Structures are given as structure tokens and as C-alpha cells.
Design a protein around this ligand. Structure first.
Ligand SMILES: CNC(=O)c1cc(C#N)cc(C)c1NC(=O)c1cc(Cn2nnc(C(F)(F)F)n2)nn1-c1ncccc1Cl
Ligand SMILES: CNC(=O)c1cc(C#N)cc(C)c1NC(=O)c1cc(Cn2nnc(C(F)(F)F)n2)nn1-c1ncccc1Cl
Ligand SMILES: Nc1ncnc2c1ncn2[C@@H]1O[C@H](COP(=O)(O)OP(=O)(O)OP(=O)(O)O)[C@@H](O)[C@H]1O
Ligand SMILES: Nc1ncnc2c1ncn2[C@@H]1O[C@H](COP(=O)(O)OP(=O)(O)OP(=O)(O)O)[C@@H](O)[C@H]1O
Ligand SMILES: Cn1c(=O)c2c(ncn2C)n(C)c1=O
Ligand SMILES: [Ca+2]
Ligand SMILES: [Zn+2]
Ligand SMILES: [Zn+2]
Lengths: 727, 146, 48, 49
């Protein structure tokens, strides 16, 4: 609201702030000289944290060159000599941790207790040329004396770091906000170099973002990112979902759902990061089951290499079975040229792969099932309580099977929202009978259980229909079905050891190029079945011309009496034609007789040459054609995506052009302004606040998120336009 | 230089100094660079093509073995699907190279015994190994050159 | 080629108005811009 | 990089290059953050004093 931000811009509020600036720079540098003064000083840092966030919330709705920004900067330079004293206090107490991490001063202490001598550590700081002369006696006075041989550099590093943590980040925000807001202020240029160390210690934990709301203006929004949110973001199990999410959105997804899938992907990531934080490192039993499933999930991707190298090992040995008439009827024995325990080696290798495949099947059920079930249950709950899927209209085999989940009490139990039953009830309980829709949902004590919360081992529990529904939906996952085929054939491998030869095909199913060839055979092969359907009709019209007429020709009379005939019974000749006809290179003529007997010859010679051209030189090439071209396209789509993502923003709607008329323009636009990652992180910040601490834009983007309208995304600019010129 | 001095051991090793023709004249280097560059992504295809012939060589070892035989004359009954290590080989010496897939080098499924199954075993060979895989490979090389 | 011409048409009709002479650009600088331009403003069906 | 570690101590390291003062460049640039006796032993600057 401007009407308050105008009145605050015209009082003596700056002159109030200047007095607060002068008391802050002098209270700390007096209070930094005792251990028994530290209780007071933590309160002071939390106070000026709350002061500068008032300055930030005063500087929201800010234009690039506005008088509020200009009254902010001269007030900082009317309060110069103290504001560097607070800046140098942040600057000295941050390099103190980085200096003591060097081994040059751990070598300067010879005490095994760690109690470094004061004059020894005094010349240590005098050895490095970054601090000043008066700084070390300021630091020696900050140190404890303890018979002048003990400063205890370890506790001295982190003592004044954790209470000074958020405020040192927060002052860097205001300095980098105003410097990014107004250009050409050399006092700010004096300020930014004076506070360089607090910038780089608080540049990775910072994140920038740019949203456009509040009557068509984009503005830089700033936030904190924890160490924990960046630790479980740079995991490959999270990253593999990201590389797929890059693919299927810019390839087949339109521009509309590309934000809706994005926040769904953002909602997808928070669940799997939560479940990765869940697994991060008589009675009893619980301990054993928990420790087991943690180790199993921890391996998983590393466990699978053991299954593959075992299938190679058993199959290489199994490439030695020999058959004989007499055993050393026919028996299938093993050759064993050396190591006569090599059949016992194969027997051991089989068990190990079946157990390993079992230990994969079970580890897949704690790093997949929760993600796919959450994804269905969220989609269903939102697409119901908004569009009315099961109350206004009616259906789909995905919908028809999911009818059985509308009455379990633990329906959203693997989802963050648990009040979606009361949501669509209080939204649609007046258009229809609310007793009916409660019976549709099975809300027990719908008249009674709502006010009670207001005023005040069979599988462990006893679950039923929600487990049957879960087991159906997980059985439907293509990647679970493959891993179930791999497990099935492993146990079937104990019936006859040769069935471990089918576990070799896993080679084709993982290594990219191979999967591309099989996907080429399948994708365009749906359009190909009509070609081989047409190719049947062709050989078939050929097999009648012969049956009727040329039959004397078609004969394989071995010798006199022996006169095997081929075009007597059609059911066979079509077959013959398909066993030697389509495969012979020389079409069909090769497998019959010279049209010597002029009888029909000319006609006979026309019958072959026509076969050729058609079946062998045309059709049998079209088929190859299909496959090859499919592979080619496959390879081309993979290409595309690459280019695209390396030629557009993916967030705003501008390629590397406007952002190209400048050295490393694009990059800066990606790594700082528009980092898909940023737009994500933003959300766990938003999610983890309290709704009472959200700022203006921080509540504004939240309340638009909570009803799923997506107009805060820029889509057309990025300061490089809205303010294009002035800058 | 190495092969030049090795050319004094047997004068025929100067035949390897002929390949320098391919290594200089543009187009030629393009063909060999095509074989190498996409051929790194190709080794997984010929790795897949091994698995294919191999799953074929078990179906036979177990079942159809009576068919696989090159009995020159009576007593002389050279067998092929007795020792696997050989039959995989056989299949890779006449199977992949014959134009008519494998059937050409065995016997008519006259004896109905399994015939239908035997006839399905060949026509499937064809399509797969000779008309699909052995084309993908060519495909890779040609497209790389392109 | 046959397969490629069938492709083309598709793209074209999903990248131009078919009534006025502007692609999904000026009508793209806005949420679901094109659609609104087709389903309400320029619906070939409408002109019929 | 691992094979090129053996060139950091020959005196004729930049001897087939136009710059010959690159030893004094990174010494006078980084001899205060670390021990300049250490980085001279890393470079093998004889009579560095
Ligand atoms: C098929 N996909 C599967 O998930 C799969 C499911 C089940 C079940 N139940 C069992 C196995 C063995 C599976 N297979 C892989 O899991 C797998 C295969 C390959 C490609 N393969 N071809 N060549 C090469 C090699 F020889 F060079 F190694 N590897 N990689 N790969 C892989 N990926 C990531 C981590 C570890 C691996 Cl082992
Ligand atoms: C392979 N590259 C090499 O550098 C090379 C290294 C060593 C060593 N040790 C020895 C030789 C002979 C080398 N070869 C060439 O040096 C060379 C080959 C060709 C192509 N070749 N194909 N056809 C034709 C021809 F028949 F028509 F002549 N030439 N041109 N060419 C070329 N280039 C530029 C200048 C002179 C020449 Cl001779
Ligand atoms: N907002 C963006 N604008 C343009 N390109 C982007 C944007 N975001 C991501 N990219 C592209 O996608 C990549 C981001 O993640 P990606 O996994 O595809 O590669 P990377 O980040 O460079 O390497 P890695 O993540 O493995 O360390 C960038 O390299 C960049 O090329
Ligand atoms: N004025 C237009 N501008 C852009 N695209 C158009 C326009 N008119 C029609 N189209 C395209 O052609 C389609 C219109 O009829 P079409 O049969 O091709 O597909 P559809 O209408 O979406 O599906 P259906 O008609 O079978 O219910 C639209 O989907 C749309 O993609
Ligand atoms: C608690 N919670 C949320 O509040 C949330 C979410 N995704 C979106 N929101 C809002 N996830 C995954 C979540 O666990
Ligand atoms: Ca508030
Ligand atoms: Zn952009
Ligand atoms: Zn138009």
C-alpha cells in the first residue's frame, strides 16, 4: 500500500533509523568484550534483523529509480561512519572462520590440548595480510586470556557466527537489492566492495527470482535457501526425474500445462525429498525391518549391477552345455574343461541372482510406490474437488478402477492434504444432498466428528480395500511390470538353468541407443502392422494364380515316384510361398522350374518378375524402411529438446537473442534470473514459513498458488524489458 | 614409421602403408570417422545383436537339434547342435550371413514334428537378424556419414 | 515425403490463424492466447 | 594435470614460451595467502631470497 509508504517517507523515520544505526554500531563493539555479555547481544541482532525487513517491506512495490530508493541510500551515507563499523564487524568476524581453517596456524599451535597461545596466534593473524593492526588486539580482547596461552580458536570461530547468521544474510539482501535497483551510485560501489565477504558467504544461500504481479510489473524477489534444501536437491535420484521432466514437457507438452506440470513436478519433488529424508541415516522387530529396508533402498541402483554381472557370469558358463547319445534318452550335461566344481558355481550363481532380483523387487516398493500413488491420489482429489469428476459428471478404466478408493478413511494418507473431503463437501453439499455425497465419501460421524476436533498385529493395523487398490495400481506401472517379468523368469530359471538366457536381454533395455531401436520397432510398428497385413494379402493373391494355373511347375519330385507336390493343398502353398518365396533373394522363380515348356512360359516369366519387384524389392524394403526411419526420428527428437533448451529461457518467452546482445548474456539470465531450479526452491521456502511471515509478494504468490492460477509467471519480460531502458 | 622397419622382416608388410590413401583424402577420412564416431553408440547394437543370436542358439540346442545336421554320408554325421560353444558359432558363421537367414542351412520341416514351430523359428530369425538388425547396423554407418 | 506432407499440415494449422494472417505469436504473448483467438474470435466454423 | 606435475620444478619450464616471469607473477599474487616458502618449494625457485 503506497499510502503508508508515502507517509513513512515523509516523517523523521530515517532520522529515527539513523539514531538506531548509531546505537547499533557502538553497542556491539562494546558488548563484544565479554562472555557474560552474550545473552544481550543475540537480542540486538534479532532486533536489527526486524528493522531491515521493515526497510525491505518499505522497498517493495519499488520502481527502478524511485525516491524511496534514493532516500534509502543517502540515509545510509548520512550514516556512513557507523554503517561501515557494523559492516567491518561482519567483515572481520567472517574471515576469522576462513583463516582458522588453514593449516598454517594449526601448525602454529603445538599444544596437544588445542589451547593456542595468544601471542602465537597474534603473529598468526599478523602473518596473513588481510586483517589490520588494530584488529588483532580487538580480537585478543575478544578472546579469553586464560593465563595468556589459551584462546581456544575452535570455539572462538563459531561463537559469534550462529547468532549473527541471518542478519548478515539480511543486510546483504538490502545492499544487493538497492544496488540492483538504482544504478550509478559510487557510494554503493564503495559499499559493495566493503562488504564483499558477506556477499560471497551469502550468495549460495541466497536465491533470486522474478515474478510479475501487482498490476503488470516484474520485480526481483529474494529469499533464504537452507543448507538442507540444497543438499537433497543435488541428488541423482532427484536429478534423473529432472532430466525426464525436461524431456517430456518441451517435447510433447504445450505451453499451457508447462507451468501446471512444473508445479506438479515441483510437488513431485517435495514428496520424494521428504521420503529421502525419511530414509536418511517378542519386541525388537521394528529395528531389524527398518535397518534392512534402509540398506536395500540405499543400494538399489548399486544393487542392480550385481544382478547384471551375475546374469553375464551364469550365461557365459551356460554356453558350454553339450548333448550326447550315451550319458558319461539323451542327457544334457556340462563340459567343465577346468574347475570340475563349475556346475556347482552355476548353481550358486543362480540362487544369488534370484535373491538379488527379490531384493530389487522389494527395494522398488520403497522408492517408487509412494510417488506413483501420491501422484494418482493428488490428481484425482484436485481434478474431483474442482471440476467435479464423480458428482456432476461420470466417466475411463483409470477412473472406473479408482471408484473403490472413495470410501476408505485413509484415502489421502499418502498425501499432504488431508482435508480434501471437507473441501468438496462444503463446496458441493448444497447443490446435491449432503447426506448423499457423504455416503459417497463414507464420512463417519459427519454430523458428529467435525465438532469434536473443534472443541477438543494384523499387518500392524487392519487395512483392506486401500491395499487391494494399491496392489492393482502398482501392478499397472510399466517399470514394475518389467521388474516383475525379470523376477518371474529368475525363479523359472530353476526349472531349467537355460532360462537365465532371457536375463541377458536386460542389456538392450537399459543402454539408451538399444532402447531407441526397440522403441522404433514398437512406435511406428503400430502403423506398420497394416503393411505386413498388406504384405499377407500380396503373397496370398499370388498363391491362387498358381493353385489354379501353374501347378505342374511347382514340384519337388526328389526321384521318380518321390514327387512331393506343393500346390495341391493351398493351406500349404501359401505357406511354401512364405517359407521360400519371401526369403530367397531371387523371389520365387529360384524354387521351381524353368519355363522351358512354352506352355504359359511367357505368362510364367511374367509371374516371377512381378513377384520380384513387388514382394522382394518393394514391400520387403518398405518394411526395413519403416524401422530405419523410426530409429532416425527417435534420434532427431532427442536432438531437438537439446537445441530448444539451449535457445530459450524455459521460464519467460524469449530466446537467446535479447539476452544475447551482451557478454554471456543468456547464462546470467539462466543461472541467476531464471533458474528453473530457483522457481522450485522458492516453493519449499514458501511452504516452510508460517503464512503469518509471508511478505506481500510472499502471500501474493501463495494465495494464487492455493487456487492454481498461474499468472505470476513472467511470460514476456524480465526487467530487461519492463525497465529495459532505465538501467 | 614402425610398420616400415617391420616391412624389412617380410616385404609384404609394406601392404599396410597402402592405407595411407584413406587417411588423407577428405571423403575417405569422413567414412572412417563415421564408422568411429556413431560406432561408439553402435557397440551397444552389436552387443544387442549378440544377445539375439544367442537366445536363438538355445531354443535349438534344447529342442530342434535333429534338424541341425551336416551328415555328409551315413556314418559321417557331423553334428552342430551338440556342443553349444560351437552352435552359437555355427549360427554366427552361416546364420548371420546367408541372405535366407538360417533355414537355408538345415532341413525342410517335412517331419511335421514341430514343423509349424520350426517354420516359425526361421521366419522369425529372418525378420529379426537379417532384415532388421543387419540393416540397423548399415543404417548407423550410412547416417553417420550423412 | 508422403509422410512428411501429412506432418506439415498439422504444424501449420497449429501455428497460424487460418483466417487472419498472424501465427501463434502476437496471440501468444498471453495465457492461452491462441486458443481464445481460435475458439472465440476466429473459428473457421464460425465463419461458416 | 597429473602428468604435468613434473614440470613445476624445472627452471626451463616456460623456455618455449614468450612469458618468462610467470613464476614471479603467481608468487607475488598468492605468496601471502599461503607460505611463500612453501609455494617457492612448489616451484623450485632457487635463490628466491
Ligand atoms: C533394464 N532396467 C532395469 O532397471 C533393470 C531391472 C532389473 C530388475 N528387476 C534388473 C536389471 C539388471 C535391470 N538393469 C539395469 O539396471 C541396467 C541395465 C543396463 C544396461 N546394460 N547394457 N550394457 C550394460 C553394461 F554391460 F555395460 F553394464 N548395461 N544398465 N543398467 C543399470 N542402470 C543403472 C544402474 C545400474 C544398472 Cl545395472
Ligand atoms: C596420412 N597423412 C599423413 O600426413 C601421412 C603421414 C606419413 C608419415 N609418417 C606418411 C604419409 C605418406 C602421409 N600421407 C600424406 O601426407 C597424404 C596422403 C594423402 C591422401 N592420398 N590418397 N590419395 C592420394 C593420391 F594418390 F592421389 F596422391 N593421396 N595425401 N597426402 C598428402 N597431403 C599433403 C601433402 C602431401 C601428401 Cl602425400
Ligand atoms: N532457465 C534456463 N534457460 C535456458 N537454459 C536452461 C535453463 N535452465 C536450465 N537450462 C539448461 O539446462 C541445463 C540445466 O540442467 P542440465 O542437467 O540440463 O545441464 P547442467 O545443469 O549444465 O549440468 P548438471 O546439472 O549435470 O551439473 C543447463 O546446462 C542449461 O543448458
Ligand atoms: N482458426 C484456427 N486457428 C488455429 N487453429 C485452428 C483454427 N481452426 C481450427 N484449428 C485447428 O484445427 C482443429 C479444429 O478442428 P480439428 O478436427 O482439426 O481438431 P479438434 O476440433 O480439436 O477435435 P474434434 O473436431 O474432432 O472435436 C483445432 O483442434 C485446432 O487445432
Ligand atoms: C506439507 N506439504 C505441502 O503443504 C505441500 C506439498 N506440495 C505442495 N504443498 C502446498 N507437499 C508435498 C507437502 O508435503
Ligand atoms: Ca505479516
Ligand atoms: Zn527469460
Ligand atoms: Zn487471427
Amino acid at each position: 500500500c503506497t499510502g503508508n509508504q508515502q507517509s513513512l517517507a515523509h516523517s523523521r523515520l530515517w532520522d529515527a533509523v539513523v539514531g538506531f544505526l548509531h546505537v547499533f554500531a557502538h553497542m556491539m563493539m562494546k558488548l563484544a568484550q565479554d562472555s557474560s555479555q552474550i545473552e544481550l547481544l543475540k537480542e540486538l541482532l534479532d532486533l536489527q534483523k526486524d528493522m531491515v525487513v521493515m526497510l525491505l517491506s518499505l522497498l517493495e512495490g519499488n520502481v527502478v529509480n524511485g525516491m524511496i530508493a534514493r532516500q534509502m541510500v543517502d540515509m545510509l551515507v548520512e550514516s556512513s561512519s557507523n554503517v561501515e563499523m557494523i559492516l567491518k564487524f561482519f567483515d572481520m568476524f567472517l574471515k576469522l572462520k576462513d583463516i582458522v581453517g588453514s593449516e598454517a596456524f594449526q601448525d602454529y599451535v603445538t599444544d596437544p590440548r588445542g589451547l593456542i597461545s595468544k601471542k602465537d596466534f597474534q603473529k598468526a593473524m599478523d602473518s596473513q595480510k588481510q586483517f589490520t593492526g588494530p584488529e588483532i588486539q580487538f580480537l585478543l580482547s575478544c578472546s579469553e586470556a586464560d593465563e595468556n596461552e589459551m584462546i581456544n580458536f575452535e570455539e572462538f570461530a563459531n561463537r559469534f557466527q550462529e547468532p549473527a547468521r541471518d542478519i548478515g544474510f539480511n543486510v546483504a539482501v538490502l545492499l544487493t537489492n538497492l544496488s540492483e535497483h538504482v544504478p550509478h551510485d559510487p557510494r554503493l560501489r564503495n559499499f559493495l566492495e566493503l562488504a564483499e565477504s558477506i556477499l560471497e558467504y551469502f550468495r549460495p544461500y541466497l536465491g533470486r527470482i522474478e515474478i510479475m504481479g501487482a498490476s503488470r510489473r516484474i520485480e526481483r524477489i529474494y529469499f533464504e535457501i537452507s543448507e538442507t534444501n540444497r543438499a537433497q536437491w543435488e541428488m541423482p535420484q532427484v536429478k534423473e526425474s529432472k532430466r525426464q521432466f525436461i524431456f517430456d514437457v518441451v517435447n510433447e507438452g504445450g505451453e499451457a500445462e508447462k507451468m501446471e506440470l512444473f508445479v506438479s513436478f515441483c510437488e513431485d519433488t517435495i514428496f520424494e525429498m521428504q521420503i529421502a529424508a525419511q530414509i536418511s541415516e517378542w519386541g525388537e522387530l521394528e529395528v531389524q525391518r527398518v535397518k534392512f529396508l534402509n540398506y536395500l533402498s540405499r543400494n538399489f541402483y548399486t544393487l542392480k549391477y550385481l544382478a547384471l554381472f551375475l546374469a553375464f557370469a551364469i550365461n557365459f558358463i551356460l554356453l558350454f552345455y553339450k548333448v550326447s547319445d550315451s550319458p558319461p534318452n539323451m542327457v544334457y550335461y556340462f563340459l567343465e574343461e577346468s574347475t570340475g566344481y563349475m556346475e556347482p558355481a552355476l548353481w550358486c550363481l543362480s540362487l544369488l541372482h534370484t535373491l538379488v532380483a527379490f531384493l530389487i523387487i522389494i527395494g522398488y516398493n520403497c522408492l517408487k510406490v509412494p510417488l506413483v500413488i501420491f501422484k494418482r491420489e493428488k490428481e484425482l482429489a484436485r481434478k474431483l474437488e474442482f471440476d467435479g469428476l464423480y458428482i456432476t459428471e461420470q466417466p475411463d478404466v483409470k477412473g472406473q478402477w479408482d471408484r473403490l478408493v472413495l470410501n476408505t478413511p485413509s484415502f489421502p494418507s499418502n498425501y499432504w492434504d488431508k482435508f480434501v473431503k471437507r473441501k468438496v463437501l462444503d463446496k458441493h453439499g448444497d447443490i446435491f444432498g449432503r447426506e448423499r455425497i457423504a455416503e459417497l465419501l463414507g464420512m463417519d460421524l459427519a454430523s458428529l466428528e467435525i465438532t469434536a476436533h473443534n472443541e477438543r498385529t494384523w499387518l500392524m493395523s487392519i487395512d483392506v480395500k486401500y491395499q487391494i487398490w494399491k496392489f492393482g495400481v502398482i501392478f499397472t506401472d510399466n517399470s514394475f511390470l518389467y521388474s516383475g517379468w525379470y523376477m518371474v523368469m529368475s525363479l523359472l530359471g530353476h526349472y531349467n538353468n537355460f532360462f537365465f538366457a532371457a536375463h541377458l536381454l536386460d542389456i538392450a533395455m537399459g543402454v539408451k541407443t538399444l532402447r531407441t531401436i526397440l522403441s522404433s520397432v514398437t512406435h511406428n510398428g503400430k502403423q506398420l502392422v497394416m503393411t505386413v497385413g498388406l504384405l499377407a494379402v500380396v503373397v496370398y493373391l499370388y498363391t491362387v494364380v498358381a493353385f489354379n494355373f501353374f501347378r505342374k511347375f511347382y514340384n519337388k519330385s526328389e526321384d521318380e515316384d518321390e514327387p512331393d507336390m506343393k500346390c495341391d493343398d493351398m493351406m500349404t502353398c501359401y505357406l511354401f510361398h512364405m517359407y521360400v518365396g519371401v526369403r530367397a533373394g531371387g523371389g520365387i522363380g529360384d524354387e521351381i522350374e524353368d519355363p522351358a515348356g512354352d506352355e504359359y512360359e511367357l505368362y510364367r516369366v511374367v509371374f516371377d518378375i512381378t513377384f520380384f519387384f513387388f514382394v522382394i524389392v518393394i514391400l520387403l524394403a518398405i518394411i526395413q524402411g519403416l524401422i530405419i526411419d523410426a530409429f532416425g526420428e527417435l534420434r532427431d527428437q532427442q536432438e531437438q529438446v537439446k537445441e530448444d533448451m539451449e535457445t530459450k529461457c524455459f521460464i519467460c518467452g524469449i530466446g537467446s537473442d535479447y539476452f544475447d546482445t551482451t557478454p554471456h548474456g543468456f547464462e546470467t539470465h539462466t543461472l541467476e534470473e531464471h533458474n528453473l531450479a530457483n522457481y522450485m526452491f522458492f516453493l519449499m521456502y514458501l511452504i516452510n514459513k508460517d503464512e503469518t511471515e509471508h511478505t506481500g509478494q510472499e502471500s501474493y504468490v501463495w494465495k494464487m498458488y492455493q487456487e492454481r492460477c498461474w499468472d505470476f509467471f513472467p511470460a514476456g519480460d524480465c526487467f530487461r524489458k519492463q525497465y529495459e531502458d532505465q538501467l
